[PDB]
Design a protein around this ligand. Structure first.
Ligand code: Y01
Ligand code: Y01
Ligand code: Y01
Ligand code: Y01
Ligand code: Y01
Ligand code: Y01
Ligand code: CLR
Ligand code: CLR
Lengths: 421, 421
């Protein structure tokens, strides 16, 4: 009835205009000397979530007229969805337990979002995982609408929520719970938009595990001492922060050595390389680069701030921030190159590669659990504050840290898939 | 010696980090309460231009050890390069004719840029146009460095130049010449980055021409009356601005009717559509969408401002801004769909299609010459100012209008290629 290239071009233009309309509303909102208020942005996003709910309802009632590494993706989606639903339950509980002096749009939004989350998970659980069976104008509209709805939810969570949060026991528990649960909501929308992008575009092992266990035990130790000296008063806090930075430096140096050793083992073994012209390589490559973007931006902001301070011959320079930031950039570059080469290719080289893969696997688990459980000292750095401002540095960190969490989860799954080869 | 997929991944990571370092410097610059000043950004971009000059020198001296619709692209590149070189000559002339109270980085930058421009044009003239003969790590590094150098030059021109310009006859001629020549410099860097993206990714005709001539004569008339009532004092200026808006509305309505008529002629003639799976279709499609982004953002900002003003039941609403902006969005959507379908497919349908193609060809020439020759009243709109602020609206227009010029040039060449079929 209707051609497919025109369907995909119309859907691309529709979704692009949807994104640019949301960006226009956010630009009108940020210039506070104007009539556009935050409830208007929440009403716009609420209407988008309702349209996606209606589409998913029509899709499931159409499919129920017919009858007949996925587990890593489903587990990640379900865990992040449960944390997002817990945060929405806290928001609804606050809305039914407070002095009713805020607008109705802040009550309808956490309810619809919750329904949106549930339905979206159900859809992404059941009607997508190798059960597609057709691609027409209806599914292309739905997938593109879902992509840009989740991107606008990501932008709203990144900017217009923690510039209100990061700027009576029930209020303390509410604020503490929001502080711990926020990056999992942001990463949830990152994860959902990444999956929808994928489906849119397509349609003797001793020393390794032992070093990994040392990495894990050391991360839990640093996490525990930081949370202890964060929960109580400010004494011995800066020792915990310096412990975080020295641990990060040593660990990323060891990960650079491991990934480089893997790359040199690959270089010494010559192969008829790179003849297949694999588009799946391009897909996983763009996922790893898009995940690496946030932490690369954070690290170059720290490098620029430290070099600008060093240009004054100032005190409190200390060389550890430069080493940490540059080693973080270098570590993600070498690890991305190692994973991408590993996924698309005697016995002693198998034992070396498996020990390297288990070491990097447990190191990425460690570097995931350290900010996810609430360490994150970078928000209180006095150097990048007063250079970029508190609002710009906070927004840069809100972009960087959930993308860093998604990067570590994707790298854990990818290194596990590399390991069983 | 070295595999190609690792070369392209390393080059992608290098260029991405180069862009993010430039973005970090710009973020440190925009927060003016800090040590980073504009001469540091100019020094950084100057170093990038010098590195590209050194690479192009080594490439040409390596090639000179060996011996043996392109004209539209070469003509566009050479015209925009000549206008950019004229602007750089004006900057150098000011730097040798003034009170020497600004830093040396503002003298070295317009010289090196001029050399950069000349060398880049020479390279893009001679060593690229079907003479590639090899792709290795050296060329991938050079092409990626050239891409992100031109993107950083585009961002510097968009933001850090007209927030200093748009905020004694020689000073008047200097400022007037900069006002007229600025969008051609921005479009020049857009054009060069688009060409380098392309080469990176790949490696009875009566009523039509008559309506086109009416469109051209009417555009020159509107342009002349606007420039007359802009050069002298403010009387009869708002009549010229309203004439611009009524001309735009009527013309984009006629272009919507023409493009829709072309699409319906395509729909009535059934074909075995869309089997070839053409990646060149994807390439031209991404060029047209990327060009359409700027004007779509500008139009949705105008729609949001007018709807926010209408929500007060205010005076000075007048319905022409909404009609102009929505019709602009709709016109670019239908025209993109028409061009993309036309490029990748009895006699009366040939005459209808050729008349539509000549009409759209001359209409796109008209809508190119109207802002390129200096009309651009959108900067003085009181509605989008005081809603977004003067700086945000000016930056949005500096993104939108050179992209709109590149869009109209690309559409002129594409409609000419469609016409001779
Ligand atoms: C290309 C795909 C993968 C992602 C698309 C990226 C956008 C979703 C992001 C990147 C640029 C971001 C914008 C970058 C800057 C700003 C300006 C910001 O307001 C300002 O700082 C203006 C200055 C002021 O008055 O405060 C409002 C949000 C916004 C539009 C951001 C909205 C979200 C955007 C569009
Ligand atoms: C109208 C003009 C202003 C728009 C054209 C600019 C962008 C559409 C292009 C220019 C070069 C492109 C970049 C060129 C290189 C790449 C690397 C690319 O990664 C890969 O090539 C994967 C490598 C592999 O498949 O193995 C990711 C996209 C990116 C950053 C591109 C992002 C989009 C860019 C900036
Ligand atoms: C693959 C390559 C070619 C594309 C790289 C994407 C970047 C160009 C995007 C991704 C993340 C974006 C950043 C997301 C967040 C921010 C913070 C944002 O800060 C604010 O909006 C100011 C906040 C305030 O004023 O309160 C400014 C834009 C910026 C740096 C964005 C700049 C554009 C970035 C780096
Ligand atoms: C993906 C390819 C095709 C293009 C990459 C797009 C970037 C080149 C653009 C889009 C987002 C832009 C950023 C959007 C917002 C800002 C914030 C702006 O400063 C602010 O407004 C912060 C608030 C303030 O303190 O004023 C500085 C420039 C910057 C980083 C822009 C720099 C240029 C960026 C990175
Ligand atoms: C880690 C996560 C947060 C990053 C993943 C987000 C982006 C990389 C993706 C998500 C969906 C993508 C969009 C999906 C649809 C398209 C349409 C696409 O145009 C076409 O499909 C051409 C159609 C044709 O070939 O005929 C241009 C890129 C774009 C906007 C994509 C831009 C990049 C997006 C935003
Ligand atoms: C294909 C699709 C998926 C990608 C669409 C790209 C957009 C997400 C990019 C392209 C142009 C970018 C805009 C370029 C210019 C600006 C103005 C800029 O304004 C400022 O920096 C504030 C100026 C000041 O404060 O003085 C804010 C970011 C913004 C809206 C950028 C938002 C991000 C945009 C819309
Ligand atoms: C393809 C990719 C993105 C899939 C995502 C990988 C997911 C499934 C993996 C990677 C990181 C893993 C987490 C690492 C740490 C812990 C902490 C532990 O106390 C509970 C399990 C939990 C929370 C793991 C759950 C599974 C997990 C989230
Ligand atoms: C592939 C695409 C981008 C090629 C670009 C098309 C270029 C070559 C075309 C499209 C618009 C054309 C311009 C339209 C208007 C005029 C004004 C006239 O007084 C001088 C010629 C000039 C300046 C034309 C020169 C050629 C031109 C710039």
């Amino acid at each position: 009835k209707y051609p497919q290239k025109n369907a995909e071009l119309l859907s691309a233009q529709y979704g692009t205009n949807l994104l640019l309309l949301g960006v226009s509303v956010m630009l009108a909102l940020a210039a506070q000397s104007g009539p556009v208020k935050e409830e208007h942005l929440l009403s716009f996003i609420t209407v988008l979530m309702l349209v996606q709910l209606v589409w998913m309802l029509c899709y499931m009632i159409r499919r129920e007229r017919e009858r007949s590494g996925a587990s890593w993706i489903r587990g990640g989606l379900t865990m992040l969805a449960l944390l997002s639903l817990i945060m929405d339950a806290f928001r609804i509980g606050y809305f039914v337990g407070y002095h009713s002096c805020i607008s109705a749009a802040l009550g309808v939004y956490p309810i619809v979002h919750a329904l949106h989350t549930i339905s979206q998970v159900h859809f992404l659980w059941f009607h997508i995982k190798d059960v597609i069976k057709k691609y027409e104008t209806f599914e292309r509209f739905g997938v593109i609408h879902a992509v840009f709805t989740n991107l606008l939810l990501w932008c709203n969570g990144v900017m217009s929520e923690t510039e209100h949060f990061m700027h009576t026991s029930v209020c303390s528990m509410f604020s503490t719970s929001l502080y711990y649960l926020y990056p999992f909501n942001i990463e949830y929308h990152i994860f959902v938009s990444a999956m929808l992008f994928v489906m849119w575009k397509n349609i003797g092992l001793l020393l390794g595990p032992l070093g990994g266990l040392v990495a894990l035990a050391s991360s839990v130790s640093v996490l525990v001492v930081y949370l202890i000296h964060l929960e109580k008063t400010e004494e011995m806090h800066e020792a915990a922060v310096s412990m975080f930075y020295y641990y990060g430096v040593a660990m990323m140096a060891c990960m650079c050595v491991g990934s480089g050793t893997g790359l040199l083992v690959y270089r010494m073994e010559n192969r008829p390389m790179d003849t297949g012209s694999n588009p799946a390589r391009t897909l996983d490559t763009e996922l790893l680069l898009a995940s690496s973007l946030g932490s690369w931006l954070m690290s170059w902001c720290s490098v620029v701030a430290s070099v600008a301070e060093a240009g004054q011959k100032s005190p409190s320079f200390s060389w550890t921030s430069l080493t940490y930031s540059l080693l973080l950039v270098l570590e993600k570059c070498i690890q991305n190159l190692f994973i991408v080469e590993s996924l698309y290719r005697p016995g002693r080289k198998r034992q070396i590669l498996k020990n390297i893969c288990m070491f990097l696997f447990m190191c990425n688990i460690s570097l995931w659990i350290l900010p996810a459980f609430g360490c994150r000292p970078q928000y209180d750095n006095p150097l990048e504050n007063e250079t970029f401002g508190t609002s710009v540095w906070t927004t840069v960190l809100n972009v960087a840290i959930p993308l860093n969490l998604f990067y570590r989860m994707h790298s854990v799954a990818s290194l596990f898939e590399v390991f069983r080869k």
